[PDB]
Structure formats: structure tokens, C-alpha cells
Amino acid sequence: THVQGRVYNFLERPTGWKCFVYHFAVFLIVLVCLIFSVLSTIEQYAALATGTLFWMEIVLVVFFGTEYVVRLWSAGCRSKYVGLWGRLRFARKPISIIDLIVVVASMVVLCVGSKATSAIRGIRFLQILRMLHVDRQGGTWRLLGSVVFIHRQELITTLYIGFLGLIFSSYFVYLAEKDAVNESGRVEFGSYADALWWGVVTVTTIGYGDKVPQTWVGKTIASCFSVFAISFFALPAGILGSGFALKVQQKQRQKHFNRQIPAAASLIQTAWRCYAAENPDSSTWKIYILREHHRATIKVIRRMQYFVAKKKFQQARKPYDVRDVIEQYSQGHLNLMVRIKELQRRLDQSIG
Amino acid sequence: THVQGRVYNFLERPTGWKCFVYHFAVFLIVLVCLIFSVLSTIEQYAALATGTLFWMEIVLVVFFGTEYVVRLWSAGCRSKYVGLWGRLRFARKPISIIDLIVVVASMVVLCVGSKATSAIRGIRFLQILRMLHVDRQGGTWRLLGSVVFIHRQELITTLYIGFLGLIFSSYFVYLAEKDAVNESGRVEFGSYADALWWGVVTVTTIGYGDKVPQTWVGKTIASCFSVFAISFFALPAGILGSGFALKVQQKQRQKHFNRQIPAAASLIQTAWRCYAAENPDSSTWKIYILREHHRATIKVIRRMQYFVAKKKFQQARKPYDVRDVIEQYSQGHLNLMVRIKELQRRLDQSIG
Amino acid sequence: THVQGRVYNFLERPTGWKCFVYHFAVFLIVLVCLIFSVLSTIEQYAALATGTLFWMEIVLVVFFGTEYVVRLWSAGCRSKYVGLWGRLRFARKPISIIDLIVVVASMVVLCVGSKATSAIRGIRFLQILRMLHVDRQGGTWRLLGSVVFIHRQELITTLYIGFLGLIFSSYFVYLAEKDAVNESGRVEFGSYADALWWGVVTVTTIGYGDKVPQTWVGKTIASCFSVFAISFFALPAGILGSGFALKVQQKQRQKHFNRQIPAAASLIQTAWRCYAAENPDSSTWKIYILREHHRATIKVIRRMQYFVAKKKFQQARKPYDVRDVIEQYSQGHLNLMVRIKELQRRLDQSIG
Amino acid sequence: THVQGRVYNFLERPTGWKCFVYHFAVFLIVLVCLIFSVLSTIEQYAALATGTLFWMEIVLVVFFGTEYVVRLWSAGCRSKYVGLWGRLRFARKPISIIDLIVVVASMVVLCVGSKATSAIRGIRFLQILRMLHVDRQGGTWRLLGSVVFIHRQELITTLYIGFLGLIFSSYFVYLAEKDAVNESGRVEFGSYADALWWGVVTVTTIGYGDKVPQTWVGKTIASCFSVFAISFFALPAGILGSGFALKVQQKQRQKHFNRQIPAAASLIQTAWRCYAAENPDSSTWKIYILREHHRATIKVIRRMQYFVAKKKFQQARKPYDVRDVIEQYSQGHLNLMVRIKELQRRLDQSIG
Amino acid sequence: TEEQIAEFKEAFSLFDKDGDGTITTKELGTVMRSLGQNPTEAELQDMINEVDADGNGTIDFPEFLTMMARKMKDTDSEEEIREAFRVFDKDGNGYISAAELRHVMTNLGEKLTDEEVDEMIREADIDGDGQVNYEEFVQMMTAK
Amino acid sequence: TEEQIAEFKEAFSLFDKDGDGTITTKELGTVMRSLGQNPTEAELQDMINEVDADGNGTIDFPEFLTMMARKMKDTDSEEEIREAFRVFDKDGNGYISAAELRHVMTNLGEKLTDEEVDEMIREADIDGDGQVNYEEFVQMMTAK
Amino acid sequence: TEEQIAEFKEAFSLFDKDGDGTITTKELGTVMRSLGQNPTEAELQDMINEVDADGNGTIDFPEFLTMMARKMKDTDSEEEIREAFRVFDKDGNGYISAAELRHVMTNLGEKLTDEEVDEMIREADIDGDGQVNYEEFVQMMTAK
Amino acid sequence: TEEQIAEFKEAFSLFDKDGDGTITTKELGTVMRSLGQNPTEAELQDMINEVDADGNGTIDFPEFLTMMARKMKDTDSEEEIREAFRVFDKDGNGYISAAELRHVMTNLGEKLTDEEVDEMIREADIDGDGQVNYEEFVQMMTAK
Ligand SMILES: [Ca+2]
Ligand SMILES: [Ca+2]
Ligand SMILES: [Ca+2]
Ligand SMILES: [Ca+2]
Ligand SMILES: [Ca+2]
Ligand SMILES: [Ca+2]
Ligand SMILES: [Ca+2]
């Protein structure tokens, strides 16, 4: 079946320009629905947008219901999704769960609200949840998650130290400004919660201005805290940006995809030979053509070869590095030395 | 003969100190015009600046028209711009289009508006548009565009996730602050549009302060959103800055321009030999001196040599990398092994 | 025998999931105490939170007092902490000092303040101090400190130049705005201290808005200062983030821990042989199978070998670099040349 | 003979801990003078600080006047500063000019003001200028300048594009908000100058809040401009921080200072041999031991050797790179091939 | 683990043959040639490097025990085998043609013999469809 | 394209001469020497590397077909030839002197024969003015 | 002092035996073989590289004096020896087993002789406990 | 500059002899050995690399002219010589001892002859003080 694979490539792994146009049109219609949701809150546009909302939501719920069914049927092209259990394995993905929730809640809203505040809050939140539909493969989420996980120790360090600085500076400014009254007669720092709110707003470099220290002690503490602890909250962006740039730069020194074909074939062959060694009557035993004690030796040599193949396949999928140069020189020097030893042995044997 | 090229190098691709002085003077007088336009909006300086504007704009439109004509004539020094179609190819460029528009609209304004609000709005926009005249080659735009295109996946990921966080946090803060009334009796969060405005101002770390959450739920949501989603909007600057620094660092390991002369000559020669192989009566067939079936083999060997020449020219234009070390070692080891094999062969031939 | 080691690994160097769960629970209970401290300042929650604080503080002071004693006993598993002097050497660590202070001040407060404003301020500060208990090994502090120390010259340069810019711009804006009166009749820039406060808030990109220049000279100076001197205060975050990313990238090219076993063994052996050369009747003198004047030469050769072993151990603990490639090629080329010299010498000796 | 050098190393190139303590004390006394200047502007502390300022300024002007003379005398230890013209060469340096200005203006102020507004403004600015005295060698300024110059194209690109975006967005927001009146009846955007002030404050992420767009068109334009053009102004900090981190990382792969001793000696020797070739009766002509026409060839071979020595000295002062590996392999492969050719030639001569 | 240590020691002794207590490149190559494989010196060095942890260039009994203590049923090993199989997966649907699999197995890498390639195809046969599923293949390979 | 496959198979068989189904450096060099080229081993390895995709060191019929299916009329190929020509463009106006072009062609790279260099100059002749326009040369070369 | 200079000059003369004023790899190897150590050329080059500062490939008297003027009692040297000892520390508590220490010393690196290994164990014996403390070992090693 | 091109062509012809129009490592070494310097092949390749721009491995007349058209009186050359002199400057005050300069010149790098070292010291003698100023040395060296 090739039609199933073609529609699966159209829907879940788009490539070309037609699929991009289709997905872009879906994104635009979802964005227009979100804009209408925004306009529904305004007083003058409340009635018109809500009146337009009903038919737009009917059209979208029918379209997405049809497309979900088409996609779930087309999932059978893959091997993990063949059969009933494969279909309900497809349904357990987070993106498919979100797609099902958005559609089922849409029908529930259309069937219950049509018969208040909740009846419109639900649909407003549902057309906000539809923006997750853009990323079908989760590529953006995986790209962010890999870099976040790699720099997790640095991120945790910066967050922890920044939180400590925030807590301590907020307490000190609260002590300095506990009783102060500004213009218009209002105590801006009436509690440690107010001090913490001021500290968060200041350390995130927002600075609304609704709470400002007014004593000289508070201003000095705020000056030092703003100078120092702000960098601890600006650090994660720099760490993640430099990481992203470093991965992008490393993408230019990647080995060609055809360079791992022999390594992958060798890994499969070595793994299967290790597997087939477990059969006493296997046909893999005639490679060594009586054989009674050689089996224990062969099963060890095969395991060693399998480990070597694993190492080679691991190395074939990495970008170029100094380790590659070192290994290449080691192998070349060993081969050259072996050749010169062969020359010496031949000369000594022939002429003495 | 060379006067056209000299004036083209003066105008289009400045180099030296005279051209730099000319371009700097043009930039200064354009900036003075912009400052006068700014002063024209002030009540006291409206009359004086506008009175000074007329003669300055007449002088500028005449000078820029003459310089545009001179540049268009001098464009024929190149080979792409020779002739009528070459001139309209030069005029089609975006910078030449902007230059033509700024001049023609300047004459139109000076001939229609001179003899109310639009007649000065247009001239102000036109002298705002004159600052694009500084970059004749588009070097800044190309430098930005290359780095933006290279890091496009990371930029799209950060923008998409930041937009999602903005939308969701704005909705939650709107729900938390829908009915709250601050001092002076004003509902700051009266709609999701107001919540979105607050979210943009907060997530971009501006913090005007015209909309601040006033409930504890809203303040907690704003605290978490400010801590987290702000980095997602500060990320693009870090990504692009690290990219720029990485390109600058890579500029110090570039191969000398003279190292690609043999490679370029070889590429041209191989491409022309592949082209000339298509002629049965060509004079390129006497290199291999009845030739009937050798031609099918020669046309394949020449294509292979052309591909090798393409590879070598591509490698000659890149900075040094680990791939260069690996290729150099491979070639050297192969040559050494061939030499030792020749030693063995000679010894066996001579002494047996 | 080993129970002391198991409990030390449970407490001071946690590994696994049980220790992580224990430490996470401790962190959560400390955070709950901090939240109760925040709620104690609010008027409505003042009575309930303070009433709940007493029992929770008693429970925590007993738990931490027991755990401190258990940990101090368990410190004897190591060799530096064996015995009485080892225990008081453990007690001198900053983290142990903080742990002792938090408990002793807790008992002092519960025994004196319980039997006032200070009696609550002190306990609030003490349960603020309990957040330092999370980092037992100081890993975050050491990770920050290493990168800060490495980039110390750049950090000092940026801080010094930013401070100079802040001082000069604040003085100029003070001169420009000394006599200005804004709306509501209040001189925002009444002194150089006010100008400095404005400068700090502006250069840290906070911008509360309580002090804004109102003259055109002040606005122009503020515009230039904001455009330029702000980057000098945003620089440290970028420097430290790029440094963190560079260390993380360098972590992927580290040599395996088993590669330094021969180097470490060789360093120990060479150091001990240098030490044992000092004994005239030592048994290390029989390596050379009387011996009167050879001792002065042996004691020098051993020192040279010790220095070589030190170099090898230093190199074995570093990540891969171009120096490794250069040294490997040097050694391999020397060996190959020696082998070819042996070939030539053998041929000339045998045949002449 | 060495006293002058010792005091010069004490003053201009401090090293150790005594010189560091001296310079630290000078920095602290200058900072205390700056704090007193700040306190002199405050109304309550105006009299006391000004009264204390007289004696402090007298003591400092005498100390700095004595130390300037001591330093100028001690400058003769170097070779560039020997003699009268050397002393006026030392005095011409920017730091020495600043030191002379701060002292002469101090004496002038203390002799004229003591015997109104300007008489205090000048001395306040003079104690502000004393902070430049800390950096005697200009190390921070040179470190900043090198990195700024290296990334000059990127910095210019970002600044130019950000300026264009600021200008255009300010004009569009001015058009959108020209006639709008906020609460309290005040036109925040009364002119393009006001729009430009708003644009600078917004694009630098300060956000005072004294000017905020109030129409939906203005808010939309401000939202897009804040999202995009802010990164163009945050870029320079990222570029410079990544550059600083890259230089710091490059500092760990620097060659030892002793690797350039032979190269420097060879460069000096080759340069002097090229110089001495110009003398027909020189004693450098006996190296080739009459000689009539060999001079033209010798003077060319010497020039070639000088160029090679220049290249080697340039390479010896750089950190390790891929070029070093490539050159090392090229030389080693050439030597090995020459050795194998020698083997072949010897064998063929002997037996063939 | 009496039997396990006994058989591992017997296997180690079948490689050592010297009583030294270390297995070298020469001894490994000698045994391999006794089996009839004439391995290259580079191949033998690669074989030794994996087992050898300390870095002295030989294999001690602790290293032999550590290497024999591994398992191919590991989740990472299964993922590695699947990723190796994905290189020859053109469509990406988890199926590889029987003819392409046979060609790759016989002509690339270790160059498996025809009889063992047919044995693998018999084992990895989804009712003789002709487009073998390489996920169940890895499943039963790692099942052991 | 059945005729194209037939001619490609004929050329592959002419290169092979062995019936194995792969082309090695030895066979490629043998044919090149039969034509009178005496190529270096490094040159032969470089020639093999481009065509060889799988990495086994030889050329199969699919690899031969893929290599024969390429084109020099590609836009990237045209831009590459123009960039190669710009290395000898002193000004940047798209013109290169006939004498300089002849010197470069005869004395650098593949060292074209004088007769074929004059043939190239005849083909790229802007009315014999002596300053050839190298963009028209690439235009005609890529037109095939 | 003058005695130190005199003995260092005597040692330098013993190494040189030539009066040139420089020590080369050939001379160092000659003396080492006179002691009976047959060092490798790479080993001799490594030995020369540390002492040789200027980089000319030999050892002058100032370089010899600088090398002899060092000391193993340095804090960095003590920390380095401790770090080397921590590689064989399993628990991390500052104790290394006597059997493991003996095996490592005899079978790794310079391969110390059995008699000197027993001498070290006698020196590094905390009342014959069997789990030697390697901190006091480094302490007394760096004491002199 | 007809005379300049004249003697440059004369020198190029003296180096060439073969008449081809290029100078190779073999010809350069032949002339150098005719002068009596027996240069190494690596040295000859290094000498050729600087002059050779096109990269063909030889030296054409334009390359020879470009190399002969340089100058040692350049500001960068003067700064380079000063930086080379600063390596042996201990204090950093711009003075280097006569004995240290003589030792470095005779024993490092090109290993200048004693007679020319004394000639240099005579030229670089500030009234026979014994602590020569290496700035005036470079100043008059670059004066030419
Ligand atoms: Ca052996
Ligand atoms: Ca081992
Ligand atoms: Ca074949
Ligand atoms: Ca094949
Ligand atoms: Ca020419
Ligand atoms: Ca020496
Ligand atoms: Ca000849």
C-alpha cells in the first residue's frame, strides 16, 4: 500500500511545497480564530465576533474531525502503528491526545453551551489550545529540550544562586522600607510578599515602578542587588544561545550519511553472528571449516567483534573531532610499522 | 576606457580615503536633513526649519539626480550592465529602485505641494528614506541575512515557544485580573487585548507600568511568566551574537587567496574538457594519441575528473578544519605505502 | 565497618534515588517554612502562620540537631576526619558552620525570645538562611567560581568601564537637570545622589520612572548613555554564559578515566623512586645490579623521569586538543625515522 | 643604577603585594573623595563635606604632585624616556596628560576659589576625573578596544539596522499617536522628537512609562517594534561577550614563551645578515669561502631566508591551530620520503 | 556463581596458554588463526582496546570478566541495532525489502555467507511477504 | 530512458572487463593507462571516492548510474564555474584578458594543450578585441 | 651556595664528558646505558624536552641549574601525587588496600621491583592494618 | 625602472640557467650548494613557498619581481625586529647586555660567526657602555 504512505507523508512528515501550503493555511485559519477570540472580549466587537464564532467553530470542528480520522487511518503505513493496538499506540502520543481533546471539547461545547461565562471561556481556551497543532513532529520542543538537558547543571546553578540573591535582597529591602510612606500616603513595602514582588520585578529588569525603595539604605541595597543579581537572571538566555550557536557550528562538520553504511551493515552482521552462535546446529559454524572446544573461544571472539562494531557505528555518526585524527594516525602508524617489519623480515629471510 | 571603471569604483564600490570622505559627507548632510525634519515638528522651530527645508531639498534633489545619472552611465564598466538591457538590469536592483523613488517623489513633492499635512508628511518620509542610501553594496543586510538564515531553526523555535508562553500567560492573567480595579478607579485588564499588551510589555522586559496585576494570583502568574518566558525572548540576541562571534573567529583560519588559483584553473580546464568532448571533430581528442570505442570511456573519465576538480575547488574556498587534516594524512599514508611497495617490488625484481 | 561509609554516602555525597527523595523532601519542608514566614508578615495571616510556626520550628530544630550529630559521627569514614581533630576539622567547613548556626540560634530563640519584634525577625532570618542547606558539596558555588575566576580580567574591565560611564553620565545629567521641575512640582534631580540613582536604574535597564530627564539636553545625554553604557552592564551575563557553554562543549572531548591509570601509577612510582634515592642503604639501588659515583647521575636521571611523569599525568587529565595531535605525530615520526635508520644500518652492516 | 628601575616597577608596572596595597589605598582614598563630592550636593551635608573637602584636596594635590615628579624622574629607566625629549615623550601620554591636568587644575581651583557655582562644579568634576588614575597601563581600555575593533563590522551592522528600525518605528508611532490625549490631558507624542525619545526608551528596554502609545494602531506598531528591534540593540553585548569568551578559551592553547626564542634569534640574525650584505667589505662574506658575481645570488638567498624567518617568528607567537598540524605533517612526510629515496639510491648504487 | 567463574576462567586459559595472566595481541591472533581467520594487526589491536580498560595493552582476568558480564539484550543495544537498520530503511516505515537486506548483508561489512543470510531471512520472515519487518527481527535477536 | 540504461551498462562493462559488478582503482587505472594517462594512485583514489557512495571502495552499477545522471548545466555548476573564473578577474567587471587566460590555461592546473587553448579562445571570441567576456563562455559551456 | 654550584657542575661534567657545555640525547642515553637502562629514543627526547628551556635540543648549564633547583616538597607536587593516588581510591575515603597498591605498583607504569614495593609497604603501613592510608604516605614522601 | 627590471631579470636568469622561466627547489639548492651551504630539502621548500604565490611549486618572473619589490625598512618589519629583540630583554627597559646578545647570536638560530658578531657589536655600541640599546640597532638596521 503506497497511498497510505503518501497521505501519511502529506500529514505527519510534510515535505515539498504543497504540504507546506496546506499547513500554512491551517495555521492562518487558526490564527484568525485566535484573533476573533481576542476581539470577542472587546465591548463593541463582542456580538459580531461571537456571532461569527459559531459557524467558524462548526467548520473547524468538522474539518479537524475528518482530518484526525484520516491521519489515524493513515498511521498504518508505519510498522509500529499496524493493527488495533498500533492505532491506540498512536493515540497515546501527546500531540494526538491534544488533537482529540480539542475536538471532543469542541463538540461538547457546541452541544451543551448551545443548549454563560464558562460557555465562552471554554471555547476561548480551546482556540488557544489549537496553536499547539502547528508542530506535528515536536521538532521545536525536542530541539529546546536537548539543549536544556545538556546545560542543566549550569541552568540549575544560575537559577539557585539568583533565587538566593532575590530572597536575601528582598528581605533586606523589606527591613529598610517597612515603615516608609511615599507620596499619596501608601506603604509600598507593607510585607515580605510586597518585597518579593518588588524583587522579582527588579531582578527581571522589568521595573513597573509601582514599588520603589525611598530610603537611602533601601536605595543602596537595591543598587547593589540590581547591579549584581540581574546578571544571574540574564545568564540562562546567554547559556542557551551560545549552546544553540555551538550546535549550529558543529552541524557543518558532520560526516556524510553514506559513511555509516558499512558501519551499520557491520554492526547488524556482528550482532546477528553473536545471536546465531547460540544455536549449536546453526549454519554460521561452517565459517571455521571436529569442533568441540572451539565454541567457547568463538563465542568470545564474536562478542569482541560485536563490541568493536558498536564502537565503529558510534564513531560513524559523530562529527569530525581531534579523536578522529588521533585514531587515524594510530592506525596509519601501526600499518607503516608493520610494513617496515615485513620488509626487514623478508630481507633477513632472503639474504640472511 | 578606464574612466568608466574609475568612476564606478568611486561611486558603487568605494575604496581609499577620497571615496570615504565623499560618502561620509553625504551621510552627514542627509543626517542634517533628518534633524531639520525632526525640528520641523516642534512649534517654535516649525517655521524656520521648513523655510530652510525648501532650498536644501532642491539642492539635494538636483545633486542626487545628477549622481544617479552618472552612476547609471558608469554601470556599463561591468559586463552584466552593458547595453540597454544591462541598464534596466542595474535599475531593477532594490537600492537603485529606492534611489529612483526618493528622487522622483522629491521632484513631485517640490512641484505639487510647494504650489498641507500630506505635503510635509511625504517629504518627511522621503528624507527618512534617504538613510538607506548609505549602504550602496548591501553588506550589512547580507551579513545579517546569512547569520539569520543559518540559525533559522533555532530562531523559529524560540519565537514559537515564546509566543505560546505569551498567549497562555496573558490569558491566565486576564482571567485573574478581569474584574480588578486599581487606584483612581480604572480597570487595567478590561479585555484579552489589554492582557496581551501587558504580556508583550512584560515579556520584552520594558515594563511601562500602565498595566500591573494587582491580585495575588495575577502577581504569582506574572512572577513565574516573567522568570521563565523572558529568556525565550532574550534568546535570539544571544544566538545571533554567538553566531557572529563564531564567524569572526572562523575568519582567522581562512586559507590564502592564492591557494585556490590552481584549483580554479583546474576546474575551468576540466569543465571545458568535458564540454569539448561533446565535439566528435574537436582537437581535444589528440591528447590520448582509430578511435571508435575509447570515446565512451574518455567521456566518463573526464566527467569523473570534473567532479574531482569541483570537490577540490570547494575545499580550497573553506577555512581549515579537521577534514583537511584527515584528507592530508590519507594522501600521505597512501603515498608512503605505495613507495614502500615500490621498494619491495624493486628488491624482488633485482635479487629475487 | 562499612555502615559509617553508607551513611556518609547517604548524607554528604548522595547518589541513587532514595537520597535524592530525602533531600527533595528536606528542600520542600524548608520551602514551606519560608512560605509560612512570608505569610506571617501579612495582617490577616499573621496570627495563624505565627501560631503554626512554633511547632514546625521545634520539629525542624530537633530533626536538624539529630542529623547534624549523625553526620558529624559519620564523617569518620573519610581519612581527613578521623579522630577528635578530624571532627573539629569537619566543623570548620562553611556549610557545617552554617548548619550549626541555624540550629544553635534556633534553640537560643526558642529559649530566650519565647520566654517580641526581634524574636520573630530572628527566626524569619534563620529560616531564610536554611535554603543554603540544600547544597551540601558546594557544587553550584564552585562551578560559578571557576568560570568567574577564569574570566576575571574581562569582568573587571567591563565593570570598571561601566562604572566610569555611569559616573560621568550621572554628573552630566545632574548638571542638565539640576533646576528642572516636573509636573506636580517636584525636583527629581535634586542632587548628585539622585542623579546616581537615576543612572543606576537606567543603566541596569530597569527604568522605574520615578526620575526621568525633562530637558532636551538631559534627554539627549540620557539617550546616548542608554544606547552605549547599557551594553557594558549587559556584558558580564554574555561573557559568563558563553564561558559556561564553552566548558559544556569541552566536556564532550574528555579522555576516558581509565586512560590516566598508567600515568598515575607511573607518577607515583617515579615520585617514590626519587624519594627512595635519598636512602644510601635503600633497596632501589639494585635496579642497576660497586656503585660510588653513579649515585649523583642516578639521582638526576630519576628527577628527570619524575618531571616527565608529571607532564604525562597532567596531559592525561586534559581534554583532546591540537597539542595531543602534534605530540603524537612527533613521537610517531621519530619512531619511524629510527626504524628506517635501523634498516639502513642493518643493510650496510650485512652487505656494505 | 637599579633604584630607578625598582621605583619605576613600583609605580608604572606594579607587581607583588606591596604595590597592590599601595594602589588599592590610592583607589580607596579617591573613592572616598568621590563619596564626599556626592555628599556635598545634599543640603544637610553640604557644609560639612565642603569644609572637609578643602583639607582632603590639599593633601591629595600635594601627594599627587610629589608622585608625578617621582614618576617622571623614574621614567628614565626605560630607553624611550631617556633625556629631555624622553621626558616630554612620557608627558605626552594620555594618562600622564590626565595626571598633569588633575594636578594643575587642582592647584588653580584651590588658589582661585579659596582666594561660586563654577568654583565647586570644577572641583567636583576634578575629583570625578581622578578615577581614571587607577588604570596606569591602560590594560582595560586596550582589552576592550582590541575586541571592539575585531568585531567592528558586526557592531556597525547591528547599530545601523537598529537605528533604521528605531527611526521608522518612531515615525509610524508618531503618526498613529499625533493627536491622542491620555488621562490628565497631556499629549505624550507632540512631535517626532517625543516619538524618538519614546523609541529610544522602548528599544533600550528601559521603559520609563512617561510616554506610552494609547491607540490600537500605535500599540500594534509598538508591539512589533518591541518584539523585533530590541534584539538589534541587545546584540552588541552578546557579540562582545562571546568574543571575550572565545579569546579566553584561546588563551589555554598558547605556545610556551620558550618556543619563540630560537625563532626570534633566527629573525634577528637573518635581518642583520640582510643588512650586512649591503657592505662590500663586510666580514659576513667569508661564510661562503674570488667572489665577483655571486653577490647578486647571495643577496637574494638572504632575502628569502629573512622572509622565512619572519614567517617562523609569526607562527611561533600564535596559539596552536589546524595550520600547525598541517605544516608539521607536510614537513614530516617530506622528510620521510626523502629518507626512503636515500635508501633506494644507496641500494641501487651498492648492488645495482 | 561457581559455574560462571569456572567457565570464564576456562575461556581465559584457552586464550592465555602461557600462565602469565594477560592476553596479548599475539596470543589473540594466534588463537584466531588457529580458528582460521588470519586477522589484521589493526583488527587485533581494535579487539584488544575494547576489553582492555587499564590501558597497558593486554587483558587481565578482571577485564575479561567485565567484558563477559555485558549483555546484548540492553535497551541501548536494541536502539543501536534499530538505528543501524534505519540506515537501509528507505521509506522510513520500519520495513526493509528482503532483496535489499540480502544484498547489503552479503556485500557490505562482514560479508555474511549465503547460507547464514538465508538462515537470517528464514528467521526474519513475516509470513514470507517479501518486505521483512526489521523490528521483530531485532526483538527476537535481543530476546535471547 | 531504456536506451540510456543500455549505453550506461555498456560503458560499465567496458570499465569492468571482469563481470564482478564493481569497478576498482586497479581497473580504472588499467583503462586510463590503456588510453595513455599513467595516473597516480592518489588520483585514482580521488576519482573513485566521488562516484563511490556506499564507501566499500569500488563502484557498483547504481553508483555508476547516479554519477552518469548528474549534469553540468546546473545553476550551481554555472555559479561555481563563474566563481572559478573570478579568481583571475583583476577588476571584477566580468572580463579577463585573452593573454592572461591563455597563460593560466596552459601553465596551471591540467595544463591544457596549445591547440585546445586556441580552440577555446576561438569559441570565446568577442570579435577579436582581445578582452574575452568569461560570462558568455560559461553560458555557452553550460548550454551543452 | 657555592657547594651546590660545585656539585651541580660536577654532575653536569659527568653527564657531558665532552667539555662542549651541552648535554644531548646521545650523551644522556650513553650514560643511561652505562647504568644499564637501554632507554628508547622517544624516552630520551622526552627527558631532554623538560630540562631544555631555550628549545635548541640540548641542555646548557643554566637549564641544568634551573632543573636541579626544583623541589618535590612543593604544595602543587603534593596535590598532584594525591590526585594520582585518588585514581586507585575506590570509595574515596583516602584509603587504598595494600594488595591493590602492591598489584598496581608491580604491574603498571614503571613496574617497580618486588623488594622496593615491600619497602614502600613497610614505609606506608598504619600499624599493619592492611588498608594503608595514602595521605600519610604522600606526607612523608614530600617531607624530604 | 628599466634598470631595475634589467638587474632583476639578470638575477632571475642566474638562478634559472635552464631557460624554462621558473625556479624549482632543485635549481635553488644547486645554486646554494654552488655557494657551499648544502641546504635541506625542507629548507628549500620553505624558501620556495614564500616567493611562490600561484602555488604551482616554482617561481615565475612576476613572483620574483614581487618578492624583490619588498622592503625591510617597513614599520611592520621594524616592529617585528623589536618584538624579536624583546624576547631576550629581561628587565623590559630596552637594553640588552652585550654578553647575552653575543651568546644568543653565536649559539642560537642561524649561529652567526664570531667575526660578524663582533662586527654587529661594534655597530651596536653605545659608547662602549656594555649594555647595548637594541632600539638604535634596529633603527640603523632599517635605515639601509
Ligand atoms: Ca609478546
Ligand atoms: Ca590490562
Ligand atoms: Ca571488478
Ligand atoms: Ca555493492
Ligand atoms: Ca603572465
Ligand atoms: Ca643548549
Ligand atoms: Ca633538468
Residue numbers in the entry:
A (entry chain G), B (entry chain A), C (entry chain E), D (entry chain C): 104 to 218, 223 to 396, 506 to 568
E (entry chain H), F (entry chain B), G (entry chain F), H (entry chain D): 6 to 149
Lines quoted from the article behind this entry:
The KCNQ1 Kv channel, also known as Kv7.1, is the pore-forming subunit of the slow delayed rectifier potassium channel (IKS) that plays an important role in the repolarization phase of cardiac action potentials. Importantly, KCNQ1 and other Kv7 members are regulated both by membrane voltage and the signaling lipid phosphatidylinositol 4,5-bisphosphate (PIP2). The voltage sensors close the channel at hyperpolarizing membrane voltages, while PIP2 is required for the channel to open. The human KCNQ1 channel was purified as a complex with the structurally obligate subunit calmodulin in the presence of Ca2+ and reconstituted into liposomes composed of 90: 5: 5 1-palmitoyl-2-oleoyl-sn-glycero-3-phosphocholine (POPC) to 1-palmitoyl-2- oleoyl-sn-glycero-3-phosphoglycerol (POPG) to cholesterol [wt: wt: wt] with 300 mM KCl.
From the unpolarized dataset, the best up structure (C4-symmetric) had an overall resolution of 2.9 Å. The up map is best defined in the TM domain, with local resolution estimates of ~2.4 to 2.8 Å for much of S1 through S6. Density for individual hydrogen-bonded water molecules is visible in the voltage sensor. Tightly bound phospholipid and sterol molecules are also visible at both the outer and inner leaflets of the membrane. The up structure in lipid bilayers is very similar to the depolarized structure in detergent micelles. The six positive-charged residues in S4 are positioned as such: R6 (R243) lies below the gating charge transfer center. H5 (H240) occupies the gating charge transfer center consisting of F167 from S2 and the negative-charged E170 and D202 from S2 and S3, respectively. R4 (R237) is directly above the gating charge transfer center and interacts with E160 in S2. The pore radius is ~1 Å at S349 in the up structure, which is notably smaller than the radius of a hydrated K+ ion (~4 Å). In other words, when the voltage sensor is up, PIP2 can bind to this pocket and promote channel opening.
